[model samples]
Target: EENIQEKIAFIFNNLSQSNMTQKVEELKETVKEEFMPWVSQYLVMKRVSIEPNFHSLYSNFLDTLKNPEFNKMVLNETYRNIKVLLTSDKAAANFSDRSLLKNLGHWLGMITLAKNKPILHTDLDVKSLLLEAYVKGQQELLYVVPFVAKVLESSIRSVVFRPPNPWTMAIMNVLAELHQEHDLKLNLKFEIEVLCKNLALDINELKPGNLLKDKDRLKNLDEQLS
Candidate 1:
């Protein structure tokens, strides 16, 4: 367990660094040897949660984006990988009702207002806006775990409820409530459930696991997209 923990820490550190090659491969080996036989599903779920590390990865990418000399292809691949991770159940839980409400105000202040757009998307002048939003949201989750949990339960009160649009209306509503009304505990489960539901349906089709099977493919795609 200690070895696994150390390796996991190292894995995160490596991922937090410039590239994911060595560390990701090492993690795969660790999973196959240590985690697979016993806890494959758990590990896979953890990998998919897309917070902490996803936030870290994006922050690093934002840094590279600032470097005029850095290759744009690298940035694009990294971004895509992060997106892939975000499609998992883990990622969905990370942004569930409890999760979104906690960080609602901060994210609205950043993304919706466009205060941190350039740094997040184009330049590495600072950490990515999305990364910061997650961090802030996580902090809120910690601060109001019980209340947030209750809100989460209440928001998803029905079974036959249709899902909401994640990018179009859900996120927008959360942002509006946070920024305009200063509602920190605004429940977003309806939207989050919709987003998660849509993700579950579409993510399998994306075949992210097979999409950029090789880091080189990422490099190549970045060249085309960036």
Candidate 2:
């Protein structure tokens, strides 16, 4: 009685380390509908950005599909929920029990990273999309920045250190810069501050730009930090 997750895990888990790349090349020919939905669930589940190694594995996993439709599915779903995350009065009221919010933030960063990837590629304007939601978060969603900052510290941080190996850092910089226009929460400020130290970023010096459009800058700061 093997479920899809079981089969997926068996395939991923049992791959020989020596020839794993080739193994999955052929593996991609297998069932995709199940693989993608499961992967999408995991995208928001809590790991895509948290565990650096997992991010790499997941990145490669998306590539294997060569499935733009699959990537779109993940992207559109994230967009759908994140809108509610920023606009809903209910979301703001219950931001305290915000595990769902945190996961959504992770997926948001995932797509931002995905787009900057430079997905998992879409024509969607991820930078504008993120910044747009953030203001509403401040205005109505209450927990928006807090949740994203948490994603940075808990999820996006792991993704890059595990390797941006700077895509997510651009996200961090965007969060830092956008706060210039808003009143950041005390703890949220601290979270970004600590993240700066972790990434060798100076929020004061973190210049603002279109995260999706600016790759060279992202690389410069990344090399500068290292």
Candidate 3:
């Protein structure tokens, strides 16, 4: 476990700093060849668990997104892999709800960053997928609700305060659409209020009330603020 962890860390560190295109593919190949076999062993031997290692893997995945010069292909592949892991029956059996929520939060954050970027698709489907996952996991609402609240709050605060950026703007628009058009049936009203307080935002203003009704209002507000 120690040796595998070290190798994974080394690969992620190099990937984070690397700019060479070929090196990106090479590093990915190394993970498949060197890292995944160990994972198989851990599962088979049952001596050690893969649950703890997932946190590190998730953190490193986020680190890859932080690279200024990221490879779109590599990122796409990584996203697919995580989606598989999260949805796998084995993962559900082995990992706890809290662990899943934490990783989902990180995954949502990454998707928020990639929303309008060239690396990820611009469609609203991915956002809906996140929301759907949260909804489906309502059986574990105690663990999932707070995680969703945190992601939504941070996402809102980022777009509200920061300079105009496509990614954040895209997120804001998608969220507004979700509430206005879809009615976003989640029971997040109280969580939304708490989030507003924590962010020093007006709860009333943050509410979807009038803004949802007037689609053009947000655009006009942004225009004036800019």
Question: In TM-score terms, which candidate is top?
Answer: 2
Which clashing pairs does model 2 show? 49-155, 160-163
Candidate 2, superposed: residue stretches over 4 Å from native:
1-56, 90-97, 114-142, 147-184, 206-226
Question: Which candidate, 1 or 2, has the higher TM-score?
Answer: 2
Tens digits of per-residue lDDT, candidate 3, 1-226, equal: 5865565556544543334344445555555544554533332222112233343343344354344323333344444443443344432244453454444444444345424233244322333343444344433333333444444444443543332344434433434333344333455445444654655555444323233345354333311001
Name model 1 segments beyond 4 Å from true. 33-167, 170-226
Q: After superposition, how far is residue 187 of candidate 3 from its true place, in Å?
A: 8.7
What is the RMSD, in Å, between candidate 3 and the native fold over all Cα?
10.8
Q: Candidates ranked by lDDT, best first?
A: 2, 3, 1
Error of 1 at 133 (Å): 20
Give per-model CA RMSD: 18.4, 9.7, 10.8
Tens digits of per-residue lDDT for model 1, 7-117: 765665456564655555566577444343333232223432325325435334334434322323333333333334222233334546344333322221222122222
Candidate No. with top lDDT:
2
Off by over 4 Å in 3: 1-6, 9-74, 85-98, 107-190, 207-226
List the candidates' TM-scores in order.
Answer: 0.27, 0.49, 0.39
How high a TM-score does candidate 1 get?
Answer: 0.27
Clashing pairs in 1: 49-90, 49-91
